[PDB]
Structures are given as C-alpha cells and as structure tokens.
Amino acid sequence: NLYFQGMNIETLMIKNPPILSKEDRLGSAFKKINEGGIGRIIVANEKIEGLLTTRDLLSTVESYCCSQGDLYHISTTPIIDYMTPNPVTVYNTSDEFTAINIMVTRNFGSLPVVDINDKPVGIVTEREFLLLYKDLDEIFPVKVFMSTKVQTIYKEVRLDQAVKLMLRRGFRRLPVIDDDNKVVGIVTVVNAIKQLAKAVDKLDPDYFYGKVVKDVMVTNLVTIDELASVNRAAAEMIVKRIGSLLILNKDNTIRGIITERDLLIALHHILVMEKFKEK
Template sequence: MSIHNKKKSATQMNMKVRERLNSHTKNVQKKNPHLFSSDGLLDVGPVDFDAKEAKHPGEILTLATGDVVSIPPTTTIMGSIKTMTSKGFRRVPVTDAGTKRLEGIVTSTDIIDFLGGGERNRLVQEHYKGNLLAAINAEVREIMQHNVACADFSAGIDEVITTMLDDKTGGVPIVNKDRRLIGICTEKDFLRFIAGIFTNKTVGDYMSTNVTTISPDATIVDAARIMVKRGFRRLPIVRDGVLLGIVTASNIVQFIGNGDAFEKLITGNINEAFDEPISALISKDLVWTSAEMDLGDAANLMVDKNVGSLPIFDDGKLCGIITERDFLKAMID
C-alpha cells in the first residue's frame, strides 16, 4: 500500500472510530446524564466518583470497564490465580483494602514468571526450596508489579493507547486524582470498539511475519520461559510445519487454578508439575484468517470467538500472526 493510501485509510478508520465513540458517548449520557452537559459534550464541572470532586471524565470512560475486580496485597498468589481463572481475567489490580488506592497489578505473565519462567521464580527456589504448595501461599505483593502504568480518568483514547504501547502492557487501570481505582481499560476493550468497522486496513498490514513457535514436546516451563523472555502471551505449537494449536499464558495459569498441576505433584516440587509437555494445554479450537481480511472483520471474529490472536495462513502454511496489540498500533497509525 502506498504512503498516500495508508494515510487515506488511516483517516477513514479514525473517522469511523470517532463516529462510534460519539455513539458510545450518547449511550453513556443516557445511562448517566450527570456526566454530560446539555449539548452532549463531556461536562467540565465536577463529577463525583468517590464522594470527592474530580476533573471531568475523558473519552476513555466510554470504553473502560467501571466495575473493577481488585484484590488486596495480602491476598495469596493462589488467591490471585483463582480470581483470574474464575473471572477469565489476564490481570487483576492490587489495591489497598480500605482506600482502594492502586498499589500494583498482577498479570498472567507475572504468574508464569513466578512459576518458572523468569526472575520471580527465585521466590519459589530460594525461599520455598522449590515447593509449589508453600510458594503459592505467599502474598501476591511478593510478585506483583509495583510501578504500574495507569491512566487518569480524564484521559483521551489516543493517550491511553500510547501508554499501553509504550509500556508494552495489555491493560491499564483508570484512577482518579487520589490514585483510587475507578476502572480498567484493556486491549480487548479496544478490540470490541473497532469490531465490525470497515477500516480499509488489512490484517496483512499489521500482522507479525516472524512467528516464534514451540514444539508440542516442549515442557510447560519451556513455554513459560520463552513467553517471559520474549514478552509473549501466546505461542503457536507446530510440528513439521503443521499448526496443532496455540498455548497462552492464561492456559498455564488455568493449569494451576483448576488444580491439574497439583495432580502431578509427588514431593511437592514445582518441577513435577511443569515438566509436563505443553501439548497437554493446547487450545485445539483453532480460529484463523487470511492476510486480506479487513481489520474490523478480524476484530469481530476475535471478539466472537473470544480469542486474543489469529494465526494467518497462506496456501495452507502459517505465514503470520496478529494479536490484540497490533490493533492498538493500527488505531493510532
């Protein structure tokens, strides 16, 4: 695509996104007219979120989830895993139990880092001598991220997308001026937002063609290490050029949360659980597409099938992958 055509398609996509934003704003206005002035614009007057005066709400609140599940820092690591698996979350904000001020966040990647993928695994090895049962009862503050990328509730959409891309994070908590948690915005929220919009941009324009894959014979801990080292949340599982499935960080977290990992334990050592082949965790219901699909249609497919990525095939061969993060790049390109 020429530079001129790319600029033209970007403009068209942005116009359609703004049209949907205006529609969302009107819906929010109907639900809570106190947030808006009579002309439909965001009210610059005070808005009461936490019984305190605050700045006017930004457009990000039209996308963000407002009823946020959070946990206190004294929650056990197993407790955070249970919260993730029961709610289907990839991240959970950690807040002060009394004030609800944001103190950190724990993600599925932090969990697999702790379980053997990276530096956090030192807690298991050094403090608990590799004993999984003891380690998962440590407090989540031991492994959570303390310096959390977050957004003020008056932020605009472009500002939040830039924050997420710069910090390479899949979601940002939304806070008020006192850093009290009032919402969260994730890649999936943006995916839903553009689902079905004709963008005039294709999957091929934004997919990654250098795809890191893993063998089905590799162990769970092998996959965890690759994910943590490379900053991935998912890995295609390939044998002899054939895509067998995709394993995600959430699959590994669920392996703990649903109790399957504990069935592998004999002495309690973490290696007994995570030396299992990764093929045991394969997501077998594959959803894929071609490079020619419009981004809006691809987003719609991902939302409909509840997947965070799409493998791209050309003549029956895996030639790329597009993830939720790639859609963020397209939105500000």
C-alpha cells in the first residue's frame, strides 16, 4: 500500500520537466516538446504562466493545407500566443487523490506541480499514476473501461488529415488499418509533432504534408485480452513505455482500445469505492 501512502504528490511527479519562458518562441518549444516523453511544456518565469501542450502546438497549422514563410512565422511566434494561460496546477504538498480527481473530473492529461509561491517544481501526467496499480487488488477487467467504437484511419492517408481528425475528436491516437480492415499500426500526436517539428526546424513543409500515416506510425502492436485486469494493463503500459493497448478480434480487426486516461478513470473509481467498502 506504499504508493498510496506517500505524503503528497511529490511521490509521483516528474522533477525537472521542460520549462520555457513566456518571451520564448514556438521554435524552441518544437525542439523541447517531447523531452522526458512529457508532451507538455510549462511556461514560467518566477511563477507559472501557462502550459503549452502537444495539441496547442499541433493547432498552429490548423488553418493551413503552408509555405516556408508560414513555417518561419510559426517558429518565431511568441509562446504566449498558443499556450494555455492560467493552467490548473496542484501544490507540491497536496495529495495524490485530489490530483486524480482533478484530472478525471475536468479532463486534464497533466497537472503542473508548484510550490506555495506558484513556482513550478514538477509535473504529473497520466503515466505517473499507473504505478498505483501495483498496490491494488485486481477488481476490474479491461473490458469495462476500454472504448469500443474505435476511430481508425487507413494506412495511406495523409498525416495532416490524421492530425485534423485526432484534434477534432480529442484523441491522442488512432489505430491504423489496411485493405482488410486489419490493424497495422497506431498513429499518434507524438508521431505527428515529431514531423511538424522537423518541418518547422527546416522550413520544409514536406516533412509534415508529404507524409502518409504508414510512414510515421507506431508499428508495434501491443495487445491485451479484454478479460485481463486493468492492473495488468497498467503494468504493461509501464514496461512497454506506451499509453494505450489494443484489444483485437480474432481476425485482427479492432475490438477496443484502452488508454492511460481510461486507467486513470478506473483508478478514481477504485479509490472512491474502497472508501465505501471500509464502511
């Protein structure tokens, strides 16, 4: 029961997360965005001012289909123009359950952690709460928390179109299918931002607009049985360094997807329920 027995959220947080100042430009952000695999940059000087997410950065090309000049202008854009200002944060002395509740109820994939003077000291993301499953009973199967009406994309579809769809539906990841509707990969916002970062760095739109999803997608298919525990799902996500697991039909078509967001939702439920069972 020791992961739940931490004095506070400092037990879980990533220290030294990527930070930039409000005076910095998006070019610098494109270089740092995937540092530590966080996928977000805290914007701060003395105090936290904003949070620049992967979505925030991918939105820079939302109204293009994009010149060398356009990419240069993105590169030189002040971070303040795209950051989420006044982000929700937790204090370093605060508890793990409150952080889970915030993320679950208000739909945040990360919380900056700040000290009493509002200075950033760390960050917690969905990934950091996966360790809490080590101390838990096996209560729920993957089937209960997986999503089943899975949005997929065909493997030859343009990456810019993949991005539009992800941003529109609010998914970080789309399983990729072939001619027989079999799953051949997963394209992710991390994939997409790697490519957009290259396009921005080189002022060359081809790195983003010239790619199809099969060119950049994750090709490791990590699957799980829908009757396996959410704890096993969590453990596997930690070991395989991924944020989703696929549930496949016998014919290798998609049945469902379970993500670290789903596992956070489930964890919230487990914790709330263990409050009741002690009654």
